[PDB]
């Protein structure tokens with residue numbers, strides 16, 4: 001007599017859940033997540049912005065890192081997201097409860113976030129998290145300005161429909177640094193061709209490769225740092241080997257073309 | 267047989283003309299003038315702002331200090347002024363020629379600057395400099411925003427009709443710092459009572475004391491640093507003894523009341 005299976009928790013490599021101290025990227029930009037998941041704090045005279053939070057259990061760690069940086073819960077003004085999967089948007093609901101932060105996201109990301117990542121086009125209910133509501137819906141190319149830092153949304157659908165690259169200009173050693181936080185361009189276990197839930201998946205990915213290639217991009221960061229060749233545990237050399245946006249897009253496209261061939265064969 | 271006198275150059279204490287390296291005031295704000303004359307550089311992702319230039323001969327020194335800070339001539343976007351006397355606006359014409367900078371000033375300051383400080387209400391033609399044109403006229407309370415730093419004009423007529431306090435918020439050790447660059451509140455050799463060229467001089471000064479007292483003012487700076495108890499040659503302790511805006515206003519008012527009594531007696 002065989003019962004139905006137990007629910008399976010979304011488990012991940014230890015490095016994804018390994019806390020790290022804040023790592024400075026530019027004068028007002030810091031990595032405050034874990035060794036293998038990005039969560040970017042951008043510190044402004046008019047309050048702080050967080051781009052991604054990582055996994056659901058990273059909430060208190062993020063708040064601790066913010067505190068270390070001189071950012072109290074009420075100082076957090078905005079949360080922005082690369083995409084609404086559990087390993088990047090996971091703590092967003094809790095962050096909203098515990099801080100003054102409002103979430104801006106595109107329509108697709110907002111809808112997936114509000115579902116807590118359930119009914120995912122590819123994952124189903126395999127990888128879910130506490131749902132959260134967006135406070136503001138953003139359009140492609142729309143800018144949001146916080147204490148003088150201008151964040152621009154660049155839609156790059158594929159990994160999720162609502163996948164977004166966020167760009168802004170910070171400063172370092174006296175000069176401006178155009179940072180590109182480009183979303184994932186992977187398709188882990190995705191049915192790419194003739195997917196009834198995403199009929200134009202392939203065409204969106206191709207447009208997203210071109211979008212990522214063309215971003216203003218002195219420094220590239222990615223939700224999974226390894227994808228842009230970042231090593232957050234490497235301290236002063238964390239970003240030394242980082243890819244350009246062009247190289248990141250090219251690598252993603254070559255990998256995607258291989259996955260297409262393997263799927264056709266499969 | 268006695269000829270007319272030679273023109274007298276406007277000569278000043280050596281300390282007013284003594285170059286100093288850039289002295290940091292806050293994260294994006296630096297003193298870049300001389301030991302005894304203020305010239306503030308505020309560095310922005312969207313270019314730099316200069317508040318005052320000091321004496322006419324400080325132009326190249328200022329440009330050198332800007333270079334040291336990573337600001338090239340074309341990076342200087344805006345010049346703002348406390349007041350248009352030779353020892354604060356002196357190099358402005360040359361700075362405009364040698365950089366991309368445009369000048370914003372109120373109507374009174376613009377008119378005095380365009381005259382190169384000639385026909386001064388109190389000094390006549392004693393203290394003059396190369397004339398310069400304003401590119402933008404500002405009104406009381408008007409804000410100008412450069413790469414996210416918001417500068418607000420607070421008119422404080424008296425020392426000159428167009429005397430202005432400029433306020434902005436920078437950051438330091440993680441926290442915001444509300445900087446007040448308050449203009450001079452002195453009246454050196456001025457006829458205060460029944461001055462036909464400035465009939466409401468006394469009333470303007472009194473209103474200006476109240477204005478200066480009420481400014482947003484975590485840190486006060488003044489065109490002559492001694493007036494706010496700054497010692498730019500004191501390095502890490504330059505600003506330690508700095509007055510509050512309230513104390514500066516109170517001191518100025520007590521001094522002014524004394525000058526009124528002495529004039530009545532005189």
Ligand SMILES: C[C@@H](NC(=O)CCS)C(=O)O
Pocket residue numbers: 085087184186187188224
């Ligand atoms: C590393 C892998 N990521 C995941 O499986 C979690 C959702 S992005 C990928 O995007 O290929």
Ligand SMILES: C[C@@H](NC(=O)CCS)C(=O)O
Pocket residue numbers: 351353450452453454490
């Ligand atoms: C120090 C003295 N300044 C000058 O004589 C030059 C014009 S502000 C003052 O304002 O009292």
Ligand SMILES: [Zn+2]
Pocket residue numbers: 083085159184
């Ligand atoms: Zn994902």
Ligand SMILES: [Zn+2]
Pocket residue numbers: 085087088223224
């Ligand atoms: Zn992920």
Ligand SMILES: [Zn+2]
Pocket residue numbers: 349351425450
């Ligand atoms: Zn003066």
Ligand SMILES: [Zn+2]
Pocket residue numbers: 351353354489490
């Ligand atoms: Zn002066």
